[model samples]
Target chain A: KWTSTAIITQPDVGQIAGYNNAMNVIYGQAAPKVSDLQETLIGRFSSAFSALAETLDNQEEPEKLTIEPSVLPLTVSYVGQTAEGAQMKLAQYIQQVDDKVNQELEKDLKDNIALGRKNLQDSLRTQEVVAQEQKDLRIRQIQEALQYANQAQVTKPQVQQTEDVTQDTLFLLGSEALESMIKHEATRPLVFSPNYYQTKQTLLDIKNLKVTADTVHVYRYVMKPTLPVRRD
Target chain B: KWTSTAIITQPDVGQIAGYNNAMNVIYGQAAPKVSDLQETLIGRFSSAFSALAETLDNQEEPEKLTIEPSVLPLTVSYVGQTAEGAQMKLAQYIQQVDDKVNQELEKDLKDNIALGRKNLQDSLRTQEVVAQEQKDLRIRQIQEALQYANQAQVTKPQVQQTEDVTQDTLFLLGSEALESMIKHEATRPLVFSPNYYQTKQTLLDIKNLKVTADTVHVYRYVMKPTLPVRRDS
Candidate 1:
C-alpha cells in the first residue's frame, strides 16, 4: 500500500507578466516567455507522480518501502503498508525521476538566466557613454569633497589662500586615485573599503540613472529559480 | 491589497510512527523524534506567512500585492502592483523576508540532520565488531571466488596444475583487493565501482550475515529531508 501526494501550485500572474514584458522589451523574439517555462515545469511535475506509479506497478515483487513525508515539500508518500515490497521499488523509481527532473530544471533555469544576462550586456549603452558617465561621476564626487573642505577653511581666513592651491592639486590627485580604486572594485560590487559607504553614496547617485533603465528592462527581468533543499 | 496562501499537508501516520519507533530502538531519549522536528518546521512555516504579512502591512504606503499560485512549490507571492515606487519598496521588503526565511530554514534543517547523523555515528557498533565483520567478509568473498574459478578450471581439458596454484593465489589477492576497495567505499554506500554489480553480489553474500544487526539499527535510521522548489517562475 503506497500513498503519495503531489502539490502543484501556479506562479504569480503579475510577476510572470512583468517578466515576459521585460524579456520582450530586451531580447524581442529570441527570448521565451516565462509562461512557456512554467507550463513545461507544471507538465513535468504532474507527470512525475504518474511515471512513478507506473514504474512501481510494473515491478514483480516490490521490496518493502516507506517514503518519509518530511523528505520532500511538494510530494508526500507512504509505501509498503499493504504491499510488502511496493515501497522499496517506488523509492528507487522516485529517486530516478526526481534526480532527472531536478537536473533538467537546474540546467534550464541556468541557461535562461544566462541568456537574459547576455542580452542585457549586449544591449547596454556604448563604452563612450559609460566612460563619460564615470568621468562626470568622479568630478562630481571631487567637487562635493572640495565644497566641504572649502567650508572648513572659511572659519580660518588667514590660511584660505594657501589652502586653495593645495586643495586644487588634491582635487586633481583625488580624481585619479578614485578612478583607480573604482576600477579595482568595479567587478565586485559587494567589496568595500574604509570610505566605501561614503563613496557608495556618490556611486549610487550616478547608478540611480542607469538603474532606472536597467531595472525596467533587464536587471529585474533575470528570474532566479528557488534552490531545492537536498533530502538525502 | 496583499493576498497570501499557505499549503499544509499531513505526513503519513504509519510512516511517522515507524520512524519514531526506530529512533527509540536506536538512540532512545538522546535523539529528537521526527514529530518534534516536523512541529518546529510547521511553526516556522506558519510564522513566515504571518511575519511577511505583518511587515507588508506596516509599510507606510503598501502597494497592492498579489502572490502568484504556481511560482513556488511551497510558497508563492507577488508584491507591489499599481504604484511604481510601492512595487520597488515591496520588492526589497519581500526579498529581505525571503532571504531570511530560506537562510533560517536551511540552517535549521542542516543542523537537525547533522545532529541526527552524529547521534547515529556515536551509537553505532564497536570498532572490534566492525573489524571482525570485515575479516569474516573477506574470507567469505575469497571462498566464493575460489569455488567459481575451480569449477571453470575443471571444465577445461588440459590446464597446468601451476595455473591452478596461480589462480588460487589470485583469488586470495582478489579478496584482499576487494576488501581494500570496500573499506574505501564503505562510508558512502550509494557509490558504486565499474564492476559494482558483480562485486555487489559477492558483497551481498557476506552482508547477509551482518545485515541482521546493521539493517534494524543503523542503515535504516539515516533520514533525508525533502527539497522545496522555488516559486519564482
Candidate 2:
C-alpha cells in the first residue's frame, strides 16, 4: 500500500500540439523472484546486526556480575543460531554471544552475497553500462507488474479467471480507485530509486531480541538474533 | 510482478534451543503516496533525459541540418513545453529541441529537488537517519498496502466490502497464490533499497518520441518527451 508507483509515460500531445508524432512506454513488470528477495533480506539483516554490534562495542560496556574471572566458568546460548563452546562470566558470555551472533548472521548472509556478486561480475561491463541495463530491464519488468498491481484476483485454481472487472467496470461500480491511480501515474513525477533491492529490519526483529538467563537471569546467557537467528 | 520480497525475521526458537529468549523484526511498508511517486518518477525521467541529451551532445551532434544559419531562421515547437519565438534550419531546430528538452526537464525537476531538500534540511539529520527513518516509515506503510496488494477488488461505492476471501478461501479454491506469496515473503531475504523513491523511464516514452518535420523530415521540428509530454495511460 505504501509502495510508490514510478510510471514512465509517453506523451500523445504531438497531435494536439499541431505536429504528427507518437510515443509509447514499452515495458512490463516482473514480479521479483521470491529467492532474490530472500537473499537481499538476509544480507541487509546481517549488515544491520553487524552495525548494531559495532554500536554495542562503542557503548560503555555493561557492569559485570559475580564472576571468578580467573577460574569460575559456566555454560551458555539462542535460536536460528547457538553457542556451545565453554563458559565464562556474565560479561564474557554476552560478549561471546554478541560476537557469535554477528558471525552467524554473516554466515547466513554469505549464502547469497557471494552468489549475487558472481552474477554481477559475470557481465564484466562498466558500472555505468551494468546499472543502466539493470534500470532498463527493471523498467521493462514493471509493465507486467502494473497489470496485477491494479488487481490481485483471488480465484479457485480450477476455475478460469474471468475478466470480471475492468477499469470501466470498476468505474461503473462507482469506485475510482484504479482510474485515480492510473490518472495520477500518467501525470505524476517519476521515481527512479535504484537501491530498492535490499532487505531491511522490522519491529519484530528489534523487540524480540534480548538477553536471558537460567530461570530469567540466573547464570545469564548471552543471546542475539545472529545466534540461531529465527528469521525464516 | 517483477518485484521481489525481502524479509527480516527474528527467531522464536529459544524454547526449542533450550533457552529463554525472543526475537523480532519491527518494520512496515508504506504505499508511497501518489505525489511522492510522481516526483521521483519525473526526476528520474528528467535525469535520464538530461543524461540522454548529454549523450547526444557527446555523439556526432547530428548532421549539418540544411543550414542558412548565416541568414534565414524559422518557427518550431511540442506539448507541457513549447518552442515559439524564432526559427532555424534543420540542424538548428533539432539542436534547439535537444537543449530545450534538457533545460525544461531540469526546470521541472527543481520543484521537488528544492522542496525535498528543504524538508531534509529542516531535519538536519544525517543521511543515515533520514534514509533509515524513510525506510522505517515506508516499511510501516506497507502493512497497509499488504491489505490491498492481495485483493484489489472492484467494489461498488457505498456498500461494505465483504470478507469474501482470506488465505483460507483461496486455499479452498485450490489456489495458493496469496499463501504462496505469504510463505515466500515470510522467509525471503529482506530488501532495504533506500532508493525505491525515484521514478523511471518506459518504452512508450522511448518509441513515441523522435524528430518530426513538415512532411516527415522536411525542415525538421525536433521533439522530445520533455516537451509537452502526454502520458495518461
Candidate 3:
C-alpha cells in the first residue's frame, strides 16, 4: 500500500466552524455516516486516551478525532492554488513524515481536522478568526516544511533493501484492506499524536497574502470519531 | 508513503530459534542494535499492553514483538521457491491487508517475528520440527492468501483519488518519516493486533511438497521490541 492517494480538495477554503464536524467523513465501512462515526469516535477515544495518558503522558489526549486504519498506508495530492503553493505541497510530506509521513500520516490528517472542530467556535463572529488561524497554520506549515525539505532533499536517498517484507494491514485507495508479512523498521515519533495546535488566534496575513497550500486545521480539540501495531 | 518496499530475504529457509530474537533487527534509530531493541521492546510492551488492556481488550496482549513505525506505508517483495509457490506470494499482500497491509503491515511483520521467538524452542531437539512447522505454516498462509487474492484480483481496481491529501505520520523506504494533513477514511479491525498463532504444531509435511513462498512465523509470542497515533500533528 505504498503511495496510495486521497482526495482532500478544499473546494471551499473559507471553512465554516459549524460543519467542522460535518467535514469529518470516511468511506468503505459499516459506520459510513459522518455523525455516527463522530459520536462513536469521540466516545471511544475520550476514555481510551484518558487511560493511555496514565502511561503515555507526553501525547495530547485528543477528544474529537477520526479512527484511521490505525496502522496503514496513506497518499495525498495536496495541490496548491499556485506554483509557489505547489512548492510547499511538494515538500509537505517530508517536513515531519518522510521521516514518517508515508507511514503514519495515513491517519493523522483526519485527526487533525477532528481536532479543529474541538478548538473552533461555530458562531459567525468567531468563525472569521477561526478560519484566519487555519490559514496561518497552513502557510506556516508549508514554510517550515520547505525548510525541512531543503535539508533532506539531498539526504532522502539512503538504502534500497530488497528482501522478503511483510505487512499485516495493507491499504487500497477504494477497496477494503491487505495483509503483509515483513519488514523490520523503527519509527521516530513512535506515535504521531498532536503535539499542540492553534485555532483561536487570528495571525496577521499581511493584508491577506494568500498561498494555495490548503489549511487543514489540525486544531487542538474541536471535532470528533472515526478511526496499528505490528511485531518484529 | 504510497507503495514503499522492504527486503525480507530468506537465504536460510531453515530458521533457527536462537537468532529468532537474533533475527529481530531494526534500522535508522537510536536503539539500532538487535539486542538493545529487543530488550527495550519487551520492556515497553509488557507494561504498555497491560495498560492497553485496562481499556481495550480482545486483541492479544503481546509481549514478544517489535515496534513498527505505527501509522505508515509498507511494501514487501516475497519471492518464493518456485512458480507454484510464487502464486501465493503474488496474493500474499491481500488476504488480510489491501484491507490494511500497505498501511499497518509496515509494522506488523516485525511483531510477527518477535512473536515467533516466544513460541519456538531454540534448542536443537525442537528447532528441526519448529523450522519444519514454520515451512508448513508458510505453505498454509499462501494457499489461503491465494484464495482471498483470487476474489480480489477481480476487485483490486477501485477509486483513484487525486485530492489535496495530507499525511502526518508519513513513511519513506530508506530515510525516516514524512508528514501531511489530509484524507478522510475509516478502517475495519481498527487495530491489526495478533489474534492468535501456532508454533508447536509438528504438522507432518508428508515429505514436503515445498513451494518457494518463504515462511514468516507470525508466531504468537517468542521475542521482543523494535518499534503511532496522530491528532493532526
Candidates 1 and 3 compared: the better one by DockQ is 3
Looking only at chain B, model 1 earns a TM-score of: 0.30
The TM-score ranking, best first, is: 1, 2, 3
Q: What is the TM-score of chain B alone in each candidate?
A: 0.30, 0.19, 0.17
How many clashing residue pairs, candidate 2? 108
Residue B29, candidate 1: Cα error in Å is 36
lDDT of 1 by residue, A125-213 (tens): 34335545654564455455445445544211121111122334433222322233233332311212223222322222222221121
Model 1, docking class = incorrect
Q: Estimate each model's TM-score.
A: 0.23, 0.15, 0.14
DockQ each candidate and list the results: 0.01, 0.01, 0.01
Candidate 1, B123: how far from true, in Å? 40
Q: After TM-score superposition, what is the CA distance of residue A47 in candidate 2 from its true location, in Å? A: 51
lDDT of 3 by residue, A1-232 (tens): 0121232211122332223322222111211244332342232222222222222322344221112322322123223334344335334432322222112222333333332232232222233443343444333333333333332332231223333212111121111111011111111122111212222221211112221223222112221110101110
What is the alpha-carbon lDDT for the whole of candidate 2? 0.27
Docking class of 3: incorrect
Poorest 10 consecutive residues by lDDT, candidate 1 chain A: A217-226
> Best-fitting candidate, measured by TM-score?
1
Runs in model 1 with CA error above 4 Å? A1-47, A51-84, A123-232, B1-233
Over 4 Å off, model 2:
A1-232, B1-88, B123-233
